[PDB]
Amino acid sequence: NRDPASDQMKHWKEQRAAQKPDVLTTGGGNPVGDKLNSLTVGPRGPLLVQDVVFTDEMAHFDRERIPERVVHAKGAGAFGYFEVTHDITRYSKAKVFEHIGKRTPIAVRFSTVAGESGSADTVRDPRGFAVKFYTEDGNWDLVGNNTPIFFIRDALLFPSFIHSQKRNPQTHLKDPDMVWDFWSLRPESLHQVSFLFSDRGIPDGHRHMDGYGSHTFKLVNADGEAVYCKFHYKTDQGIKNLSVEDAARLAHEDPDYGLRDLFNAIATGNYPSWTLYIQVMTFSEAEIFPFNPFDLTKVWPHGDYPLIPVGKLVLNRNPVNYFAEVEQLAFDPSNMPPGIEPSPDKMLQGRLFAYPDTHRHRLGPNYLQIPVNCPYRARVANYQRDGPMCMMDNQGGAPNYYPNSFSAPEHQPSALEHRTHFSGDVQRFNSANDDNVTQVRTFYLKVLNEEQRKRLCENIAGHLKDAQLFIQKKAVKNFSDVHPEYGSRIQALLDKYNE
Amino acid sequence: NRDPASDQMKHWKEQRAAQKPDVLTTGGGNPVGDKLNSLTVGPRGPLLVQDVVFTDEMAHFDRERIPERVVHAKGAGAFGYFEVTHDITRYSKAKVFEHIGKRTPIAVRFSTVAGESGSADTVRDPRGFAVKFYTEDGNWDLVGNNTPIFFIRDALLFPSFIHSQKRNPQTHLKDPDMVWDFWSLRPESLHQVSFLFSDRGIPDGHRHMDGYGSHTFKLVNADGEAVYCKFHYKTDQGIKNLSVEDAARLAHEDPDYGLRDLFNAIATGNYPSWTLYIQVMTFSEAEIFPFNPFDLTKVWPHGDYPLIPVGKLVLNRNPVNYFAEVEQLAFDPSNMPPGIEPSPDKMLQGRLFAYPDTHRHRLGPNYLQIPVNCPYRARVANYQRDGPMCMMDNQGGAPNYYPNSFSAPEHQPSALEHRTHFSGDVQRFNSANDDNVTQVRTFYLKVLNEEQRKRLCENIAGHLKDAQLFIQKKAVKNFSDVHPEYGSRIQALLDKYNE
Amino acid sequence: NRDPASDQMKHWKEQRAAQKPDVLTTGGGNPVGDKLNSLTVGPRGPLLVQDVVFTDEMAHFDRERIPERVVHAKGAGAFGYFEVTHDITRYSKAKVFEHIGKRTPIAVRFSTVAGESGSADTVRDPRGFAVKFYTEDGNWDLVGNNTPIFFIRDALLFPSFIHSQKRNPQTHLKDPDMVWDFWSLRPESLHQVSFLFSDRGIPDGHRHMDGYGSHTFKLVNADGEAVYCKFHYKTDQGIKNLSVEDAARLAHEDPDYGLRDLFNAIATGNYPSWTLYIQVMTFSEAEIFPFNPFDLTKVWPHGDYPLIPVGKLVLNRNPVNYFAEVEQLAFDPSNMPPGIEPSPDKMLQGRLFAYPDTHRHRLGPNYLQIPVNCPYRARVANYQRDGPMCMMDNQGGAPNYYPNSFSAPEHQPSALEHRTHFSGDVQRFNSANDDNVTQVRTFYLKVLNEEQRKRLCENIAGHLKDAQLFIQKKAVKNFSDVHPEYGSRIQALLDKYNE
Amino acid sequence: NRDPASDQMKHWKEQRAAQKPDVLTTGGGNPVGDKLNSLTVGPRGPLLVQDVVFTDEMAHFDRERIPERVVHAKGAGAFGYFEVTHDITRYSKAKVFEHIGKRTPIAVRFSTVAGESGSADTVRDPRGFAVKFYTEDGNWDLVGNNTPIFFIRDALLFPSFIHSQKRNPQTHLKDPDMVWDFWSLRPESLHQVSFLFSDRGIPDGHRHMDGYGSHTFKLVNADGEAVYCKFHYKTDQGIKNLSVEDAARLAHEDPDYGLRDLFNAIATGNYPSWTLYIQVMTFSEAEIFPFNPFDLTKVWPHGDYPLIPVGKLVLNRNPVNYFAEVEQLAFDPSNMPPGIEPSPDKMLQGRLFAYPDTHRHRLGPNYLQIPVNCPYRARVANYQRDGPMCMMDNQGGAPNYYPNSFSAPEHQPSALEHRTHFSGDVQRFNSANDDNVTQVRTFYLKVLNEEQRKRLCENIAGHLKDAQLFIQKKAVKNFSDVHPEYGSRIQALLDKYNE
Ligand code: HEM
């Protein structure tokens, strides 16, 4: 017949079988003897307020929509697991790395960035690769992307950036002037901009790309010794990226390409997978590191920082109900069990606040009470109560104040943070010029070869060319700073475009 | 050693054997090492966004409150069950009345009307007596008051009325001028105003009061024969009211007098109960009734239409967590299973809409998904999906349109609403003059005794006194029309208060 | 220099030549010193909760999104005026037709139906054409589409219909099975299902299509004399539509082609306009009409019910802030001022409820207080108070109960709805068999030509081909019921599809 | 006639006289013909969905309530101005203090702490005194209290503290086992607990108590020099407290005693006023100072740190509409104009988040857009956009990303916050031991006389007399740790109650 995805309803009805159709009830459970004709006074008379089957049903349809994610709105999710294949415990004590073989159920959602709920997957844009570990020490949310770096290092420029990447406030259209006037004013973006306008800007499906945590993190062992790290989960399906024409086609032929590709892969048992590594780095080294170690616009070279294998990431279960399981999924970077802590990364720091904050608005104050979000492999005990849409028992009638004297939830000297030291005037430090060329330069010449460079510039040229001459100048100028050739090369194409 | 109530945390810590701790965790489930001292820079430095322990808890704290019931904000709840003791199947084919012995679990909520969440129980106001019958056909909400009548008979004046019974738009104080200027212009209230300022005006606890569905409903047997009815559930603890004096004392001595009573009663195994009856009135009779059988400001004389016993209401368990189980409840008059239907009672007609409406707002669209409100003894299946805070599995990946060729839920033609015939134009018919005195008089000089007759006139004059003069007259005028010795009695009383 | 839409920011900066930039402030107005670098404890230290500039901005960014329209999500809007050009004061006493030359401000929003916010503009799909008239008697929203009919005729099927027209509950992809299973089973759609798949399914922008009320409405004059009617507003720019070819190209080349088109036309002064006509069926004729006169899947042949000019609709003003002025925009079919009323059209009926309903959710309880939604050309005086995000003065300290003796607002007896008569039993009268082929046949034969019939069956087959065989069978069957030739062309052309 | 409050409507009519009342309309401005009788088919017939007048008004009524503040729900409000009478220019460069005689609009809401919206005004509970200053540098919210200290000095303890003061998790009643349990295990509260149970526990209205910025703040002049200060606003009407029985009866007599008292004062011309003072402490001194200068349970003595005069606070205007103006009022300690800055206070720091956070919950993302909260004497311009119920034009078509090259809002280097250098390990420094008795001892003995002292004990015992003996013991122990006779005295009383 057709793909497993397209055969959704069929398979469902068969798995049903002789079973008789459940009785069609109202939201309240009352049966409905006829849900196709409205209660009216006469066969051509008014609809009666009395028809509560209608109002019950209808009224729910009127509220079916919740706000889409402010970014990474378009995406698909799957459920699988994480299996430990190595002992990394000598660095981090996270009970999720306790011992080789220990499997931890995971949830994942891939996505793009700019486009809204109804956009196409096969477009150039970073890619969301969020992983949720339902550990026994609560939930670990590794909110990564398919890139190890980002366009900026100060959370303060995120809202502004995303704006420049979406629609003009008045026309509602995509604005090249917004996109570029911005990037041009913030060279610190050059690194990721490059990586973006390259063959990695449009990966062929989610199964054919890598996942990165970007931010520098922190691991704490048993003795309480800490280290900075980088999470890397390389794909076992091999890197496969799409072409401008192939994506441009798939944009209209099948805007949900990734979604369908992913569903089908797992639906046929062809489970995609990823290996997970890390990059350990001592505070002493971080002291020596040539760049800001917690600067999101940079990477920790493999040469000096080899990747240590941790375990495996398998996806083998497709969502049953997409809304209740994927749409509602919510990953909060602040969710790190004892053993994994954040790092002084300005960018990351801001995220600690943003995810639960927005979740409280997209899903609701009690979003953690949603199944897909609930840490079902841990016992939630604390002194928080009420809040709209409170499921479960609300910790019944246990003591809500802390401390107390009636045997209620307690501390955890073992689950204490790792104390590091910091000195310096508590102020706003201008991190504007922490070098926006070095790593971009190497990328451009070492990692890229001549044909890839050829593409990079045409890709940039085809978009940049729509911005205003002045922005273009400012833009090209920045590329030259990474390399005279980068500039002139793109410059060349532009003048052409301006036909 | 105090009452059961006061010894809440007590009995809790006790029954905790013999078992430690659960570990204090965040919402995510990550254990909290120390949650008594904010993570700060230096012993006298600022706060770190990095203290997600803090942010996480504070955040939740900032959202515990939700809008209180528009009306009937203050109250107590309890659970138990209902059981059949009489066969009325020759009247209604509802599964809740199946055969004698049939035990249907229930949830009940008592409350006041005008006062807010802070107000006290022990004051002059009607009382909210709502029953939630969790049946196999869905939930059946019997939303009723401590009286069989109300002040008005057209939903269009309820909001206006409920406004008059609350604070001044400007001062935020209770305003007698509002109350009585409204009552005066609408004599239909006479009947209920009288029942309000009568000894019944303030019961002693929720246990010593009666219950009523107030409105006229519809019953239909498995044979399709329908007949108008009126529910009645009298207390088995005997009717017991509270002197104006006591009420006021209790008012401030224990604003929550209603709660603890009801609570302890059950705690000390002394479970409350009421005797459910029904008044049956064929359509024929209804066509003959000297009054509108659907007028909320009227009663069915017991002599002409006696009470048939049908069952017992037993509240034998107290809520474990008030919020989750009582404040979060949801009673929907529209929730009537097969065998039970509404009547053209203009007020009821309005409640068919307003209740689910507000619930969606106070609690949220998926409020029927809240445990307390979910019909757990029915298989809720249909074509409704999503909505904010969507719990459950959202009915999985089942066909979502009706009709469908994939074995999704079918309709049960055995629950189709009863087919009645109405003839006449669609218009706004004035019920303002549907006799607002007759039944009132027969209640004054007939139901009440000279003794309690004077108490009434006193109670009324004490409030009416605070109203403007032009307000006081019109008011009396009405009473005068119920019986001269009624208005004159009050008037006289007024002039005295009037100095 | 490019199209006016592109230079949006240019002409802006250009717009305020003079004028010096405003000061960057927080939400509270507090002036911002440095908005680019967060306040960390040291150049490489953590983030301080003490940084309010951050939090303020971030917390807001995090809540920018609201639920998109449950249907007709992706749209475009404009403002202009409506002028009366003919006297139809004998049919309706509506103040908006009050006299030749009279101009009434209007707001308009065009749209697709199924696609979400990211979706492409140029796709086969009906098109929405909502007009809000800010008249003296309050607002009058005429919520029309680009077709005079619809797919169903009973609101209870609508939620289902849409569900089918959207993503699969599990895969989240578009399911043709769903689409055609629904249509195949509900033959009342044939009519619209045909129009839709005809060249009219993909209009060339919004400026090249007619607008219709679709529903039969009731007009009422000064003598209380009522008549039924149909609203039509034909484009003055000429009917123009895109070919499946260009339409599919534009889909990826310019997903917002409709937006960009409407903006530019206005931006350059080339204002689009439509002439509004109306048909008039007298209560008598409605009775002898060959079909049900309130059946949305039918039409009043120009032949027996000639169109009558009324005035002109002109759009000469682009939105300044899309979100605020278009996205937040809301239309309620229930918003009809004196002299204009509904018919018993089952579909129109449900609509009277659903729009104000959703708005109360998508926008919020007081959504009528949002600028674009406020009937600023009328004085809202009533007994409504409070609700979240309540602006203006909340009607100040005015009496909040009706009636009252304090001069608060009074009703207007000349706005009382025209009273009609209906008789019969109050029940769910089945309408699934009200002739779903006659008018459909006239379309396939008299309104189209061979060249066209060829494209239609080609367009139907293109999509339908993806539905299980048993489903196609069912569909072809229904087509044959309209005309043998019809089902064949599709069937044959289908057989070609199945290799 | 009676007082101004009682004659509210009476006056509204009079002044509003010589004017025909407004036409009653729907939310959409459509005039309603009859708003007293619903629309039904026939006199005793069902209600029609057709009746949108009904649904409109009802739907809005069903949504009047919003969540009440989590703390300080019961309060009263008013508006006035602030007048600088003295020059502290050398301390703060805050425009509010610019010159002598400089008037600035203000808003004020007084409140209790634990009691909900329906609770009574006169009870032992602190008092809220929030002053909203609408200055040119944005609004400055001085969220004070009627006391200078607080029960605790760490944020994490607050949500827990507040719980002990509110209802029980299950029985939902006020619980002394929690009240005292928390206070027992937490001896730092000793200072405020003594102050609370003192004569100052129940002020005779709001006009007879003082105001205290409570926390320690930082002031910055034009030359970047900072200093730590305390805000004081002494009552001009003099300190007048209510008796324990006077207040206890007034409780049920007049639950809105504070509300009325204030409304009338202003209403008759007797405007209440307060004098604003500032205590100043230099960093040097802040060094020698001998407990934590930021500890909230500690106060600066006028002795070594004298009270400097700053200006006047006068309230000469009542709210016209309570909901819109007082209920919707939102004060954010985080709102601080240039010249005013937080201080290391853990407590305060924590308040910097809760307030805006909870507001976005209780009121909505755009709460600052509600009139009374809007910083109208300032010019809001930034890069924040959209959000639900977005009022205004949303800043129109202005560029929305910063930095940009199109002349959008620029920043002010002048408003750059004062930089304070901090050193020390980053961890959760225990503050449970910072003297929880010294200052307190100086009250019971020095500040308090024999008389008051007698009741302080009596007041405490009277309450604590309901907690498990094992709790009482602890309580007394901490009191004696304050001073032998303190606990001893209490303990004595305790026994008599123990019966
Ligand atoms: C008879 C069944 C119908 C019902 C119950 C119904 C219901 C709805 C609902 C609940 C909304 C949603 C969006 C929002 O305001 O956020 C909506 C939007 C829309 N409907 Fe349908 N509708 C019906 C038929 C149609 C027809 C047949 C046309 C035209 C007369 C139409 C045109 C529109 C348009 C243009 C929008 C979105 C417009 C805007 O706010 O600018 N609808 N409808």
CATH of the domain at A23: 4.10.91.20
Helix boundaries (H) for D363-483: 438-442, 450-464, 469-480
CB C250 near ligand 1, within 6 Å: no
CB atoms near residue C488 (< 10 Å): 15
Domain check: are B183 and B53 in the same one? no
Alpha-carbon gap, residue A282 to A293, rounded angstroms: 11
CB contact under 8 A, D401 and A50: no
Q: Closest partner residue to B178 among C45, C157, C401, by Cβ?
A: C401
- Report which of B150, B130, B263, B131 is spatially closest to residue B207, judged by C-alpha positions: B263
Q: Which of C11, C14, C30 to mutate to test the interface with D (most CBs of D within 10 A)?
A: C30
- Burial profile D378-403: b = 16 or more Cβ within 10 angstroms, e = fewer: bebbbbbbbbbbbbeebbebbbbbbb
Residue nearest atom 37 in ligand 1 by C-alpha distance: C72
Domain check: are B44 and B77 in the same one? no
Structure tokens at A78: 């799957």
Q: Closest partner residue to C419 among B41, B170, B425, by Cβ?
A: B425
Q: Within 13 Å and on the Cβ side, how many CA atoms surround C149?
A: 25
Supply angle C-alpha C255, C261, C264, rounded to 5. Answer: 130
Which residues, other chains included, contact D21 with Cβ-Cβ below 8 Å and sequence gap of 6+? C381, C407, C408, C409, C410
CB C359 near ligand 1, within 6 Å: yes
- Interface size C-D, in CB pairs within 8 Å, comes to 361
Alpha-carbon gap, residue B171 to D2, rounded angstroms: 14
DSSP A25: B
Q: Are the C-beta atoms of C56 and C49 separated by less than 8 Å?
A: no
CB contact under 8 A, D50 and A50: no
SS3 C174: strand
Q: Which residue, chain included where needed, has tokens 């490019």?
A: C2
CB C186 near ligand 1, within 6 Å: no
Rg of chain B over CA atoms, in angstroms?
26
CB atoms near residue D332 (< 10 Å): 29
H-helix or E-strand spanning residue B128: strand B128-135
Supply angle C-alpha B126, B127, B133, rounded to 5. Answer: 145
Structure tokens at C204: 């060339």
Domain check: are D288 and D316 in the same one? yes
Q: Within 13 Å and on the Cβ side, how many CA atoms surround C449?
A: 1
Q: Which residue, chain included where needed, has tokens 């999985």?
A: B396
CB contact under 8 A, D397 and A170: yes
H-helix or E-strand spanning residue C351: helix C346-362
Alpha-carbon gap, residue A31 to A25, rounded angstroms: 4
Tell me the residue type at C492: A
CB C356 near ligand 1, within 6 Å: no
CB atoms near residue C312 (< 10 Å): 18
- Ligand 1 mean position to D63 CA, how many Å? 23
C273-281/C211-212 β-pairing: unpaired
Which among D65, D99, D121 is the end of a domain? Answer: D65
Q: Are the C-beta atoms of C241 and C196 separated by less than 8 Å?
A: no
Q: Are the C-beta atoms of B292 and B431 separated by less than 8 Å?
A: yes
CATH code for the domain of D344:
2.40.180.10
Q: Are the C-beta atoms of D381 and D375 separated by less than 8 Å?
A: no
Helix boundaries (H) for B234-370: 244-253, 257-267, 283-288, 322, 346-362
Residue nearest atom 9 in ligand 1 by C-alpha distance: C355
Q: Give burial (CB, 10 Å; 0-12/13-18/19+) of D455.
A: middle
D194: alpha, beta or left, given left = phi > 0 and alpha = psi -120 to 50? alpha
Start-to-end Cα distance in chain B: 51
CB C69 near ligand 1, within 6 Å: yes
CATH code for the domain of D482:
1.20.1370.60
Which residues, other chains included, contact B358 with Cβ-Cβ below 8 Å and sequence gap of 6+? B69, B70, D62, D63
SS3 D60: helix
Query: What residues pair up with C142 in beta bridges, in sequence order?
Result: C131
CB C112 near ligand 1, within 6 Å: no
Active site residue A72: yes
CB atoms near residue C151 (< 10 Å): 25
Alpha-carbon gap, residue C97 to C108, rounded angstroms: 19
CB C330 near ligand 1, within 6 Å: yes
How far off is chain B from D138, nearest CA to CA, in Å? 24
Domain check: are A235 and A370 in the same one? yes
Domain check: are D59 and D78 in the same one? no
Supply angle C-alpha B386, B390, B395, rounded to 5. Answer: 65
Domain check: are D254 and D163 in the same one? no
Alpha-carbon gap, residue B165 to D130, rounded angstroms: 30
Supply angle C-alpha A93, A97, A99, rounded to 5. Answer: 110
Tell me the residue type at D294: F
H-helix or E-strand spanning residue C439: helix C438-442
Alpha-carbon gap, residue D352 to B40, rounded angstroms: 14
The CA-based dihedral angle spanning residues A434, A437, A440, A441, taken in that order and rounded to the nearest 10 degrees: -140
Domain check: are A138 and A223 in the same one? yes
Whole-number Cα distances in Å, B55 to A428, A485, B494: 22, 48, 59
Number of domains comprising chain D: 3
Helix boundaries (H) for A337-449: 346-362, 438-442
Domain that holds residue A15: 1-65
Nearest CA in chain A to C262: A171
D26 touches chain C (CB under 8 A): yes
Query: What residues pair up with D17 in beta bridges, in sequence order?
Result: none
The CA-based dihedral angle spanning residues C90, C95, C99, C102, taken in that order and rounded to the nearest 10 degrees: -150
Please tell me chain A's helix, strand, coil percentages from 3-state DSSP, rounded to the nearest 5. Answer: 30, 20, 50
Question: Is the residue at C426 inside a domain?
Answer: no
Catalytic choice (A30, A37, A60, A72): A72
CB C126 near ligand 1, within 6 Å: no
Q: Are the C-beta atoms of A278 and A284 separated by less than 8 Å?
A: no
CB C232 near ligand 1, within 6 Å: no
Q: Which residue, chain included where needed, has tokens 């949002």?
A: C370
Q: Closest partner residue to B9 among A21, A395, A399, by Cβ?
A: A399
D496 touches chain B (CB under 8 A): no
- Report which of C64, C461, D291, B21 is spatially closest to residue A162, judged by C-alpha positions: C64
Q: Are the C-beta atoms of C117 and D4 separated by less than 8 Å?
A: no
Domain check: are D1 and D61 in the same one? yes
Which among A38, A65, A92 is the end of a domain? Answer: A65
Helix boundaries (H) for C190-291: 190-196, 244-253, 257-267, 283-288
A470 touches chain D (CB under 8 A): yes
Domain check: are D309 and D441 in the same one? no
Phi, psi of A476 (to 5 degrees): -55, -45
Residue nearest atom 5 in ligand 1 by C-alpha distance: C351
Q: Which of B41, B50, B156 to mutate to test the interface with A (most CBs of A within 10 A)?
A: B50
The beta strands (E) that lie in C385-488 are given as 420-427
How far off is chain B from D264, nearest CA to CA, in Å? 10
Domain check: are C107 and C142 in the same one? yes
B273-281/B217-220 β-pairing: unpaired
Helix axes A52-61, C158-165, angle to 10 degrees: 30
Tell me the residue type at A183: W
Catalytically annotated residues of C: 72, 145
Alpha-carbon gap, residue D27 to D31, rounded angstroms: 10
Q: Which atom in ligand 1 lies closest to the alpha carbon of residue C68? A: 16
Question: Is the residue at D140 inside a domain?
Answer: yes
Which residues, other chains included, contact A445 with Cβ-Cβ below 8 Å and sequence gap of 6+? A483
Query: What residues pair up with B410 in beta bridges, in sequence order?
Result: A23
- Burial profile C73-100: b = 16 or more Cβ within 10 angstroms, e = fewer: bbbbbbbbbbbbeeebbebbbbbbbbee
Alpha-carbon gap, residue D486 to D461, rounded angstroms: 11
Q: Are the C-beta atoms of A235 and A272 separated by less than 8 Å?
A: yes
Q: Which atom in ligand 1 lies closest to the alpha carbon of residue C72? A: 37
Alpha-carbon gap, residue A327 to A313, rounded angstroms: 21
SS3 B120: coil
Domain check: are A285 and A332 in the same one? yes
3-state secondary structure A244-299: HHHHHHHHHHCCCHHHHHHHHHHHCCCCCEEEEEECCECHHHHHHCCCCCCCCCCC
Q: Which residue, chain included where needed, has tokens 């992706």?
A: C74
Ordered strands of the A217-220 beta sheet:
A226-229, A217-220, A340-341
D21 touches chain C (CB under 8 A): yes
Question: Is the residue at B382 inside a domain?
Answer: no
* Chains sharing 3 or more CB pairs under 8 A with chain C: A, B, D
CB contact under 8 A, B385 and C428: no
Phi, psi of B48 (to 5 degrees): -100, 130
Which residues, other chains included, contact A448 with Cβ-Cβ below 8 Å and sequence gap of 6+? A198, A456
Alpha-carbon gap, residue C146 to C201, rounded angstroms: 9
Number of residues in chain D: 499
Domain check: are D265 and D194 in the same one? no
Question: Is the residue at C384 inside a domain?
Answer: no
Which among C374, C394, C424 is the end of a domain? Answer: C374
Start-to-end Cα distance in chain D: 50
Resolution in Å, one decimal place = 2.8
CB contact under 8 A, D38 and B318: no
Please tell me chain D's helix, strand, coil percentages from 3-state DSSP, rounded to the nearest 5. Answer: 35, 20, 50
Catalytic choice (D11, D30, D37, D72): D72
Q: Which atom in ligand 1 lies closest to the alpha carbon of residue C126? A: 28
H-helix or E-strand spanning residue D181: helix D176-185
Question: Is the residue at C395 inside a domain?
Answer: no
Q: Which residue, chain included where needed, has tokens 């008697």?
A: C137
C161 touches chain B (CB under 8 A): yes
Which residues, other chains included, contact A442 with Cβ-Cβ below 8 Å and sequence gap of 6+? none
Q: Are the C-beta atoms of C261 and C207 separated by less than 8 Å?
A: yes
CB atoms near residue B413 (< 10 Å): 10
Question: Is the residue at B429 inside a domain?
Answer: no
CB C326 near ligand 1, within 6 Å: no
Question: Is the residue at C413 inside a domain?
Answer: no
Question: Is the residue at D208 inside a domain?
Answer: yes
Alpha-carbon gap, residue C24 to C12, rounded angstroms: 18
Which residues, other chains included, contact C473 with Cβ-Cβ below 8 Å and sequence gap of 6+? none
Residue nearest atom 22 in ligand 1 by C-alpha distance: C351
Q: Which of A343, A401, A419, A470 to mutate to test the interface with D (most CBs of D within 10 A)?
A: A401
* Chains sharing 3 or more CB pairs under 8 A with chain D: A, B, C
Alpha-carbon gap, residue D87 to D72, rounded angstroms: 34
Helix axes C469-480, C176-185, angle to 10 degrees: 40
Q: Are the C-beta atoms of C111 and C128 separated by less than 8 Å?
A: yes
Structure tokens at A298: 């940079």
Residue nearest atom 6 in ligand 1 by C-alpha distance: C351
A65 touches chain D (CB under 8 A): no
Tell me the residue type at C485: E
Q: Closest partner residue to A64 among C70, C120, C174, by Cβ?
A: C70
Q: Which chain A residues touch D406 with a CB distance below 8 Å?
A: 181
